[PDB]
Ligand SMILES: Nc1nc2c(ncn2[C@@H]2O[C@H](COP(=O)(O)OP(=O)(O)NP(=O)(O)O)[C@@H](O)[C@H]2O)c(=O)[nH]1
């Protein structure tokens with residue numbers, strides 16, 4: 001009689017194509033990684049229940065392709081957002097500001113947003129030094145973390161941070 | 174001028190070697206497949222004039238603890254600096270624009286390096302990361318000859334890097 005919960009949060013994945021959104025998703029939900037995964041067709045979502053400061057939080061995580069699309073069904077009802085860029089490709093990070101723009105035009109304006117932060121496993125190819133993305137995120141009010149969906153680093157931590165924060169600001173109101 | 178056509182043909186020794194490494198993957202340094210590449214590619218490619226730093230770098234590369242970060246312009250910098258600078262390569266010891274910095278442990282200080290050193294080191298590192306993908310079950314959609322030719326490609330990049338043929342962006 002599980003899959004029984006208290007609160008339900010919908011988090012969406014956004015960022016350029018090829019940054020690792022779908023593998024972040026599969027790593028969190030199914031603990032699977034796909035080295036050869038292709039670009040996502042349509043939109044998809046998966047669910048995982050975790051526990052947060054004693055109150056049951058079940059996360060319904062949304063994912064879609066990075067690159068006109070019917071953009072407002074995906075954002076509609078999103079209480080959280082993961083803005084994802086590739087640490088090894090600076091251009092993916094440069095489009096973060098624009099992913100942010102499209103994040104609050106066609107979606108909620110007190111949506112919880114975390115900057116990611118992916119493919120941290122590629123250390124010799126690092127394009128974005130942590131200080132610059134952390135500067136940008138801190139200055140834009142966004143929380144920030146660096147993940148590797150490949151070696152699982154900070155995936156759980158990231159999702160649990162955005163979840164704890166959404167929980168906390170659904171505890172206030 | 175006459176026409177030369179670029180061709181590609183698998184050396185059967187290297188190919189059987191690789192197929193028999195593919196059949197039972199290991200990162201063990203003494204396996205023939207890796208041993209050869211160590212002797213012909215890796216060791217000469219990470220050979221630099223300051224060589225305790227160079228060997229530290231090699232160990233960092235096979236331990237996957239090495240990190241390469243781009244360093245941008247900055248008029249001011251806290252200094253505990255041997256570690257080189259924007260002026261000079263910490264590895265080869267000469268005066269060149271260093272657009273990259275290197276860290277061994279993370280858990281370590283930074284060392285500035287020429288784009289050339291960056292190219293060699295990243296060549297080796299790319300080889301190691303691909304071979305590690307293979308050793309684990311991460312590569313499932315690539316045919317055996319594809320895998321082989323990717324290994325050949327990486328060894329190409331390392332071979333060119335050896336002789337001073339490198340790319341800079
Ligand atoms: N080294 C490394 N590669 C990763 C990591 N995460 C994903 N990748 C790789 O990067 C590529 C793109 O991954 P994918 O998850 O499909 O990205 P995406 O954001 O879903 N793309 P799309 O927006 O088109 O659906 C794949 O080759 C995948 O294996 C990571 O943490 N490290």
Ligand SMILES: [Mg+2]
Nearest residue numbers: 021022039040
């Ligand atoms: Mg995808």
